[model samples]
Target: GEFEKLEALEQLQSHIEGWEGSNLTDICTQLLLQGTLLKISAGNIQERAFFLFDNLLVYCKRKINGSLYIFRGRINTEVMEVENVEDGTADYHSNGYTVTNGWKIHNTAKNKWFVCMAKTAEEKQKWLDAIIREREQRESLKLGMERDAYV
Candidate 1:
């Protein structure tokens, strides 16, 4: 257990070092590992924590690419862009999806268009889930599904 913690921390630090210019892969990796360590340390091994962890990872990665569009000021909001685009739009494609496209400089808040190519396979799945959730919500509204419908 201690070794796991140490390994996780080491991975976290290494991930942070490579984290630059909105690298969602690093961000997601850190979050997932941290979350996993948190669950292990807390003795909370419920399926939901793992589920949430997996979900977060998927959203982070999937959104990372399209994030460039959002970060570029091309899209109004990250959540919004994920909500609007069809399966074959600039936001989403048959092959893949774009995450954010804009960036804001730290402190100064200056905005500019930038390309982001930093992410992992895990991060990519995180983003796909994000879009999936958006699509789910859209379908839910269309189908008039209530929040507590399952309950």
Candidate 2:
């Protein structure tokens, strides 16, 4: 069924728009950049914690009423775009517990804003750096099929 899967991916790639303005290679690159760190709330709306995996740019939300670290919501990272997380260009908030550091992440797919904060200043920079790096790499990683040169 791997072939079928590939076939499906191929079909999707051909018909659907990928990242960085409709490119599948960028999408592929984004899918390979993951391994989430502890992401806390970043906005004063009393947000929740979240995590993202590299496989599909999948984001996981911490269950509001579950164990200390249970997450359930899944977000496909590539389907949505991110911005305003370059250098503490946003504000952060917290739960009953105190947390610091903040960044802004916008969901291009949904046109929604999701702010997340880290535990430290360095962590904040690192998270944004990594996110931007992956996005850049994703857009720059070019895996498009070769085309014939024109005369």
Q: lDDT winner among the candidates?
A: 2
lDDT per residue as tens, model 1, 1-151: 5456546644433423222343333322222322111111122211111112211221111112212101112121222322222222322121233433211111112232222221344543454454466446456664676655864
lDDT score for candidate 2 against the true structure: 0.45
Quote each prediction's TM-score: 0.24, 0.46
Model 2: runs farther than 4 Å from truth? 1-49, 61-71, 85-100, 143-151
Off by over 4 Å in 1: 1-71, 74-118, 145-151
Per-structure clash totals for the candidates = 28, 1
Computed on alpha carbons, the lDDT of every model, listed in order, comes to: 0.28, 0.45
Please write out the lDDT profile of model 2 over residues 40-122, one tens digit for every residue.
Answer: 43333433433332324434333322233333344455665654444324333233334346655656666666556565677
lDDT of 1: 0.28
> In model 2, what is the error at residue 82, expressed in angstroms?
2.9
